[PDB]
């Protein structure tokens, strides 16, 4: 998948099988505010093309591609402009969580936008960081729509659990904590141990299937994806393009 057209066909094919799509525009690495605005135009194109596609409309983005480090204010201003367009079309925008020095700014942006009244925006939290439980607790008043991941970056042992056993343990802790608090939670993991435990837990707790989902990368464990959709789970696959 390279182009938007190829990505939207991929979404079509998933939908035939009861699985949903998350569209993720990757661009060249944004080096300047002008590049952040060019990336923004690619996002506005994405929103436009998803508009009145009949199925659920979800995009994922990286805030560094809107110039987060160059200027948080500008990244916020450009994201706001995107959400003003996306909200009225029913397009949900997930803010992908990047590496640890960018976490505080990411949460400030999310909080700011929520406080302005946008509601079809979510966050990602990563179980490998020490800081994540407090971030989750701090965010409960906002009622976040939350995607839970383990974490994709090499991080130092002062900020992240060094042990994979601890990373996995924190994932289940945070997941259950979020669900017990009433948040919609997307579980973005391939780990069959964690998936089995979460299916067990939601059943035992009587958490309806409409309150959580599973997320997989496009093409990874595709049988499992179809199996979960057949059992009535909300399942999404993440489709990068660009
Ligand atoms: C659908 C989806 C979305 C993701 N979004 C993020 C993100 O925003 N930030 C991040 O660090 N990792 C993200 N990840 C990566 C996870 O951190 C993890 O590295 C990867 O899926 C492998 O771990 P797992 O299958 O054992 O849970 C995502 C993974 C999936 C499947």
Numbering used by the authors: 38 to 279
What did the publication describing this PDB structure actually write?
Proline dehydrogenase (ProDH, EC 1.5.5.2) is a ubiquitous flavoenzyme involved in proline catabolism. It oxidises L-proline to Δ1-pyrroline-5-carboxylate (P5C), which is non-enzymatically hydrolysed to glutamic semialdehyde (GSA). ProDH adopts a distorted (βα)8 TIM-barrel fold. Next to methylenetetrahydrofolate reductase (MTHFR), ProDH is the only known TIM-barrel enzyme that contains an FAD cofactor.
From this variant, the MBP-tag could be successfully removed and the purified ProDH fragment was used for crystallisation. The three-dimensional model for TtProDH ΔABC comprises residues 38–279. Using ESI-MS, we detected that the C-terminal helix α8 of MBP-TtProDH ΔABC is unstable and becomes proteolytically cleaved in E. coli after Thr287. Deletion of the last 22 residues might increase the flexibility of the remaining C-terminal end of the protein and explain why residues 280–287 are not visible in the crystal structure. For the FAD cofactor, no electron density was observed for the adenosine 5′-monophosphate (AMP) moiety. This suggests that either the AMP part of the FAD shows multiple orientations and therefore is highly mobile, or that (part of) the bound cofactor is FMN instead of FAD. The mode of binding of the FMN-part of the flavin cofactor is strictly conserved compared to that of TtProDH. This revealed that TtProDH ΔABC contains 78 ± 5% FMN and 22 ± 5% FAD, similar as for holo-EE. The TtProDH variant ΔABC reveals that helices αA, αB, αC and α8 are not essential for binding of the flavin cofactor in TtProDH.
